[PDB]
Amino acid sequence: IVEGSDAEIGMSPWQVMLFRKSPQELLCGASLISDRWVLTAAHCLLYPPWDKNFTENDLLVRIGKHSRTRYERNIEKISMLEKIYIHPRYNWRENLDRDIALMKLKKPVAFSDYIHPVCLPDRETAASLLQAGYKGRVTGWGNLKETGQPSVLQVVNLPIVERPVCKDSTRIRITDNMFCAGYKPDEGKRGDACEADSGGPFVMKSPFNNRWYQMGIVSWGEGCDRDGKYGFYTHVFRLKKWIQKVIDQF
Amino acid sequence: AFNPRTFGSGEADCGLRPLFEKKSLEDKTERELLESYID
Ligand SMILES: *C[C@@](*)(O)[C@H](CCCNC(N)=[NH2+])NC(=O)[C@@H]1CCCN1C(=O)[C@H](N)Cc1ccccc1
Ligand SMILES: *[C@@H]1O[C@H](CO)[C@@H](O)[C@H](O)[C@H]1NC(C)=O
Ligand code: NA
Ligand SMILES: [Zn+2]
Ligand SMILES: [Zn+2]
Numbered sequence: 001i002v003e004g005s006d007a008e009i010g011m012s013p014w015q016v017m018l019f020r021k022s023p024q025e026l027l028c029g030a031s032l033i034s035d036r037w038v039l040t041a042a043h044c045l046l047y048p049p050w051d052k053n054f055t056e057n058d059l060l061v062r063i064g065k066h067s068r069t070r071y072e073r074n075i076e077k078i079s080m081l082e083k084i085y086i087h088p089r090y091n092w093r094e095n096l097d098r099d100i101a102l103m104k105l106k107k108p109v110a111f112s113d114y115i116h117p118v119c120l121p122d123r124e125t126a127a128s129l130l131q132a133g134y135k136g137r138v139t140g141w142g143n144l145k146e147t148g149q150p151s152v153l154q155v156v157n158l159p160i161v162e163r164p165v166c167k168d169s170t171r172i173r174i175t176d177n178m179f180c181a182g183y184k185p186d187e188g189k190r191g192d193a194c195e196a197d198s199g200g201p202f203v204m205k206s207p208f209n210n211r212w213y214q215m216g217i218v219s220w221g222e223g224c225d226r227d228g229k230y231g232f233y234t235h236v237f238r239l240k241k242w243i244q245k246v247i248d249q250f
Numbered sequence: 251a252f253n254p255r256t257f258g259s260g261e262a263d264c265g266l267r268p269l270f271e272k273k274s275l276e277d278k279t280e281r282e283l284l285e286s287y288i289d
């Protein structure tokens with residue numbers, strides 16, 4: 001996260017850290033949507049060009065983590081994966097269309113003050129909150145700038161950007177399965193997700209029922225926090241049926 | 251939306267943080283989002 005701030009303790013209890021098992025290496029972010037299901041970016045799991053094609057056993061996830069250097073005994077939880085599900089129509093060759101994947105934990109985790117799931121949007125919530133100008137929140141342990149890495153989870157709030165403006169900021173082919181967010185050069189504020197923030201959640205607090213909902217997944221961008229450029233996120237609501245199909249399948 | 255038996259738990263106890271919403275406490279930047287809703 002570039003130009004962000006430290007997150008307070010327990011501010012993002014659905015925050016998940018995706019790790020490479022051997023050798024241990026932080027790879028991406030992810031989010032906890034239930035006691036056993038974790039959402040993340042497909043490219044975090046499958047991106048052949050970067051020699052990424054992980055199997056359940058190549059990875060570990062850490063939940064409720066406050067520091068990346070030490071182990072909070074009975075606070076942070078390390079879980080193994082039972083199964084990985086990548087969207088079948090994920091286009092890694094071209095524009096990362098449908099950059100979404102689900103991972104089922106081997107054993108469900110107990111919720112605590114530091115571990116709790118984020119909500120997934122319903123039709124009504126998505127309609128009223130997913131509008132240009134409305135701000136969301138992105139969190140992550142990724143790079144502090146185009147490069148280093150933070151010792152505390154980072155956070156930044158960013159406005160959703162109108163489609164036409166997103167489309168003009170890049171020549172990469174944008175789809176309805178993506179939305180972008182970030183401040184315009186003229187808005188005077190900065191901030192963006194960056195390398196290794198992929199998979200992290202872009203969340204919005206519903207003023208209605210006071211619950212946090214995951215609207216997007218950090219997916220891609222060109223550089224980090226550059227003027228006239230915006231971060232792209234997987235449009236979660238648009239792909240909820242696939243999520244339903246997968247979770248209600250297995 | 252989700253069958254509890256597959257989803258697990260959480261559908262009904264999501265998006266409410268123990269250390270914030272559960273204690274009626276606002277985090278330090280949350281108001282920025284609320285204000286972005288206000289026109
Ligand atoms: C995997 C993630 O860590 C990462 C998140 C990037 C978020 N960046 C900003 N500014 N919010 N994604 C990437 O690194 C992805 C993976 C594939 C390459 N990529 C890119 O962002 C490229 N820089 C651009 C791109 C390449 C191919 C298809 C779409 C975009
Ligand atoms: C993933 O690795 C498996 C071999 O272990 C391979 O069959 C599959 O085609 C790979 N997925 C690709 C490269 O998209
Ligand atoms: Na920008
Ligand atoms: Zn500091
Ligand atoms: Zn290749």
Ligand SMILES: [Zn+2]
Nearest residue numbers: 066067072075
């Ligand atoms: Zn701690």
Ligand SMILES: [Zn+2]
Nearest residue numbers: 111112116263
């Ligand atoms: Zn609870």
